Amino acid sequence: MKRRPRKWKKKGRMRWKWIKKRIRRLKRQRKKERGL
């Protein structure tokens, strides 16, 4: 997914392992629901 290590730093944001998991759940809908 071509990640960049500046974003695991947790200073003023939320965990990256849990943001990726939420980008995926949207790319699953833009694809089923007429991502055809």
CB of 11 to RNA, least distance (A): 4
Q: Does 30 bind RNA (CB under 7 A)?
A: yes
CB of 27 to RNA, least distance (A): 5
Among 5, 11, 18, 33, binds RNA (CB under 7 A): 11
Q: Does 15 bind RNA (CB under 7 A)?
A: no
Token output for 17: 């392992």
Please check whether residue 23 is in contact with residue 1, taking contact to mean a CB–CB distance below 8 angstroms: no
